[PDB]
Amino acid sequence: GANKTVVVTTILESPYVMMKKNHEMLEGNERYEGYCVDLAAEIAKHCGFKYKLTIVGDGKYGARDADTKIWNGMVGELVYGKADIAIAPLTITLVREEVIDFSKPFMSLGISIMIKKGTPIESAEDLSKQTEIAYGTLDSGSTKEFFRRSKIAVFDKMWTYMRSAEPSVFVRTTAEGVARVRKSKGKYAYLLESTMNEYIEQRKPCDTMKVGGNLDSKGYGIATPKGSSLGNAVNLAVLKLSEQGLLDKLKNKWWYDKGECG
Amino acid sequence: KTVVVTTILESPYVMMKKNHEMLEGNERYEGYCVDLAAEIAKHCGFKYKLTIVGDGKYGARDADTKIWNGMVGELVYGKADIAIAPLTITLVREEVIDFSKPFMSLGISIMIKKGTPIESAEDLSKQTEIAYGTLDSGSTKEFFRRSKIAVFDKMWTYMRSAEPSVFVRTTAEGVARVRKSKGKYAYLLESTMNEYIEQRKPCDTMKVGGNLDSKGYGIATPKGSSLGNAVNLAVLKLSEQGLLDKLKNKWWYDKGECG
Numbered sequence: 001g002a003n004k005t006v007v008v009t010t011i012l013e014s015p016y017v018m019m020k021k022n023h024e025m026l027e028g029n030e031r032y033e034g035y036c037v038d039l040a041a042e043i044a045k046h047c048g049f050k051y052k053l054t055i056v057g058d059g060k061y062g063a064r065d066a067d068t069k070i071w072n073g074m075v076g077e078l079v080y081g082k083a084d085i086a087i088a089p090l091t092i093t094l095v096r097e098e099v100i101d102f103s104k105p106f107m108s109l110g111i112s113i114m115i116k117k118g119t120p121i122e123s124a125e126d127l128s129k130q131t132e133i134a135y136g137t138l139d140s141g142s143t144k145e146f147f148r149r150s151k152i153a154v155f156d157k158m159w160t161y162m163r164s165a166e167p168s169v170f171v172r173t174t175a176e177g178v179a180r181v182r183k184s185k186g187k188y189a190y191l192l193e194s195t196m197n198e199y200i201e202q203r204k205p206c207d208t209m210k211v212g213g214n215l216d217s218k219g220y221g222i223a224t225p226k227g228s229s230l231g232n233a234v235n236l237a238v239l240k241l242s243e244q245g246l247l248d249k250l251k252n253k254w255w256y257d258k259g260e261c262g
Numbered sequence: 263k264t265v266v267v268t269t270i271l272e273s274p275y276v277m278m279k280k281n282h283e284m285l286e287g288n289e290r291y292e293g294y295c296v297d298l299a300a301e302i303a304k305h306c307g308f309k310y311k312l313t314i315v316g317d318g319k320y321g322a323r324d325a326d327t328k329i330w331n332g333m334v335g336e337l338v339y340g341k342a343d344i345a346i347a348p349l350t351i352t353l354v355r356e357e358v359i360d361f362s363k364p365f366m367s368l369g370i371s372i373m374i375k376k377g378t379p380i381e382s383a384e385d386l387s388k389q390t391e392i393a394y395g396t397l398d399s400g401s402t403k404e405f406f407r408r409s410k411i412a413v414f415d416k417m418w419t420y421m422r423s424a425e426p427s428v429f430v431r432t433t434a435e436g437v438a439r440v441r442k443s444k445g446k447y448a449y450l451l452e453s454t455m456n457e458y459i460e461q462r463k464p465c466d467t468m469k470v471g472g473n474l475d476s477k478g479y480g481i482a483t484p485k486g487s488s489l490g491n492a493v494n495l496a497v498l499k500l501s502e503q504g505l506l507d508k509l510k511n512k513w514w515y516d517k518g519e520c521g
């Protein structure tokens with residue numbers, strides 16, 4: 001049939017998607033800026049489709065409710081046919097690949113530790129062997145699922161603590177985790193993806209630090225519903241952009257060219 | 263039916279065992295990709311036969327005949343059912359074969375003999391005393407041939423016409439050239455292999471500078487293969503169980519010989 005506008009689900013997560021200065025004077029895709037906004041435009045141009053960016057209603061990446069088995073977040077938008085494609089920092093995972101399709105990765109990441117500068121923590125093993133400093137993860141994402149499912153001794157011990165900690169150590173948004181690090185005087189550490197950690201480290205007031213090596217090695221992919229006709233073209237577009245160096249330029253544009261800490 | 267796996271002799275991915283001459287079949291070989299093959303086959307439930315690619319090449323398309331060689335060619339023309347090897351995901355290959363999600367990350371990197379006054383690709387491009395080249399018939403050479411980045415295009419212009427040839431047929435030949443050229447040759451190769459060799463005797467090479475790109479290895483199948491889906495889910499399963507990280511530590515850090 002005739003060409004229709006592709007519905008893109010994404011999420012407000014800096015620097016992937018951010019509200020522009022004066023967004024209240026703008027409409028449609030012009031309201032937004034960031035790495036994934038630029039990436040959407042490049043993918044759409046190579047694949048030759050028009051699109052509308054839509055922020056996921058519940059603000060979640062995507063997890064499956066154990067009881068109802070209903071998917072939420074951006075994953076749910078694809079599963080239930082409310083969006084045609086997700087262009088966001090959406091981590092490739094086994095459970096998600098069982099229900100949606102992912103392109104080859106457009107960016108690498110691993111789980112990492114964010115501390116307030118001066119916190120006497122250097123590693124996940126350090127976190128697991130003490131109780132003075134609390135720590136947690138984002139809700140409804142791949143990081144929380146990583147710890148829930150891990151059989152590695154240190155990570156299993158961390159999950160056993162996190163799942164029962166009171167008050168809750170989990171946060172609903174990355175911004176809430178950053179605020180908790182900054183306001184807890186070194187008594188909270190935040191487990192998040194190295195990409196977001198490195199971005200925040202270069203934003204004012206320059207009071208956080210990434211410590212230790214990454215806990216795993218993964219990537220973000222552009223997601224489509226299973227059997228989608230867009231998957232093949234999107235996949236080739238990602239690989240083309242990668243080999244031309246454009247994904248590297250976009251990373252430098254939105255992370256380091258924008259750095260505020262020197 | 264028994265799955266024919268094409269792979270390539272490349273340390274520490276696939277290596278001949280000690281006393282291999284008295285062994286038979288898959289037992290002749292050891293390494294990261296040998297272990298990975300066993301894990302994939304177990305999760306997907308197939309029997310397999312490891313076969314070293316006849317021409318010893320990863321895979322490139324002949325510009326004139328448009329015939330693919332190497333492991334890529336084995337898949338395209340039906341001589342193998344799957345490739346389990348350090349085979350780089352690239353656009354040109356994705357147009358003719360299928361790749362799993364990546365099982366290992368890498369980037370192009372620089373290998374020097376210790377003490378060579380080179381710190382970056384920009385350093386190499388701005389001088390002529392130190393020659394440099396890449397492996398033939400692989401993704402690294404193709405990267406430089408197709409690049410429009412100023413530094414890498416300048417490097418390609420030099421490499422393509424240098425005499426004697428700066429390209430080598432095997433990784434081992436590139437390393438030997440670094441070690442024997444008294445600092446007058448630097449070798450462009452993937453960071454995974456660079457880091458492995460750096461920790462092998464005689465401990466006389468060094469990786470310098472950041473990686474020039476960011477990519478990964480994938481398990482490859484012919485287009486439309488019924489094995490593609492299961493293999494992909496198996497890789498992701500192994501990744502999340504931490505088994506790919508275990509395998510890396512087994513074949514890289516456990517084999518380090520330089521302290």
Ligand SMILES: CN1CNS(=O)(=O)c2ccc(CCc3ccc4c(c3)N(C)CNS4(=O)=O)cc21
Nearest residue numbers: 104105108218219242363364365367477478501
């Ligand atoms: C950025 N980029 C460009 N496109 S690409 O050539 O396909 C490509 C392949 C691999 C990586 C390395 C990072 C990564 C991403 C994704 C996964 C990983 C590891 N591992 C190691 C486990 N499997 S995965 O799919 O979660 C990056 C990459």
Ligand SMILES: N[C@@H](CCC(=O)O)C(=O)O
Nearest residue numbers: 061089090091141142143
């Ligand atoms: N990238 C993650 C969200 C962030 C996190 O879980 O740390 C996901 O796709 O679920």
Ligand SMILES: N[C@@H](CCC(=O)O)C(=O)O
Nearest residue numbers: 320348349350400401402
């Ligand atoms: N991994 C490369 C071979 C090594 C190289 O080109 O440096 C390939 O798949 O072609």
Ligand SMILES: [Cl-]
Nearest residue numbers: 003004005006
């Ligand atoms: Cl429309």
Ligand SMILES: [Cl-]
Nearest residue numbers: 263264265309
């Ligand atoms: Cl058979």
Ligand SMILES: [Cl-]
Nearest residue numbers: 279280281282
């Ligand atoms: Cl022997």
Ligand SMILES: [Cl-]
Nearest residue numbers: 317319331332
């Ligand atoms: Cl040949």
